[PDB]
Each structure stands twice: as C-alpha cells, then as structure tokens.
Symmetry: C2
Subunit: 103 residues, 2 copies
C-alpha cells in the first residue's frame, strides 16, 4: 500500500498486447518498479509491462507497453488485475482492473 | 521551474469537436499557474485551451486534459495546429508541439 496508481491512459486493449499506456502514480524508484498483470486464480498467470528506465517520468509516471494474454482465442473481453510492485520487492500498489479484447 | 517542456504525450490527433482526453508529461509546473494553449500562426491566430481542473495536474509533472473545439467545425480535411504549455504569470512557454484536428 506504499505504491499507488493515480490514473491510467487506458484500461483495455488487444489481447496481443503491444498497447502503450500512460500511468500516473505516486513516487516510484525507476530502477525498482515493474507493472504486473495478473489473474487471481489457481493458474496464477502473470505478464509484465514492457519499458526501460527512461520511460519512468520524474518518478511519477510510467509509459509502458502491455503484455499479451496467454490465450489469443477469447470470445468475450477478459478482465485481469494490474498493479505496481518493487522487483523482488514485497511492496505493491492497490490493484486496478484491465480488460483484454479479442481480434 | 526553469523552462517549460512537453516531454511526451498521449494523443496528437482527435475530433474537431474537441472533448478528447490527452495525457501530457512535462517538466515542473504549478497547478494554478500553467496552461495548455492551442493556436495558429494565422492572421486570426485562433486560440483555445485544454480543459482541466487543478486536480488533473498530477504531482507537478503531468497534465490530464480534454481538448477544445476548433474554430471551424465544418473542415474539409484534417487541420493541424501547435499547442504549447504556457505560464499564467510569467507568460513564458515551452517549445510548441503539433496537434491535428479531424472532420466529422
């Protein structure tokens, strides 16, 4: 609960990932942050937000590319959770929702 | 703050009717002392401003805003313009970026 996501560019996208999202957050260290996309279920899937250090703006924003879903053949939009977290870190932000769309 | 700077930004095109949300990452800015001015070199140097309350001025380094309707609603093709960050007091600006309005 140390980390926080204030606002996001988008909350949906192509299951193929590759979508650029602007993320407004509370202070974050550019060398110890990641954007984890995950599902809360026995399978426990997780993909990560793509981006280098330079995309973290003044420690208060992150411009990244979405990861793709593990199944491209989905019939309807699937919602998943996405949060902020320190690498190995055990510190995270509350988790917002992100939906993936078909093709 | 030194000199205004638009680091990067969301959209760079939208509808001539304005109303589109643009994320814009910039250098240090102060909530009640900054503006996002749209305009044209033109004789009639049209001018408009992005809409946003002071709450949309996230941590001094970013601005979430909606665009303003262009002055010609019925344009034949896509019309491009410059939109620079501007200071409400000093009056100084940031290098101007380009934004393109689209027809209905």
């Amino acid at each position: 609960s140390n980390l926080k996501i204030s606002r996001m560019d988008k909350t949906a996208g192509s299951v193929r990932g590759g979508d650029e999202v602007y993320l407004l957050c509370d202070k974050v260290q550019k060398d110890d942050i990641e954007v984890r996309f995950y599902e809360d279920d026995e399978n426990g899937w997780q993909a990560f937000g793509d981006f280098s250090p330079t995309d973290v703006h003044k420690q208060y924003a992150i411009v990244f590319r979405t990861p793709p879903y593990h199944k491209m053949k989905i019939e309807r939009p699937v919602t998943v959770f996405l949060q902020l977290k320190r690498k190995r870190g055990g510190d995270v932000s509350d988790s917002k929702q992100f939906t993936y769309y078909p093709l």
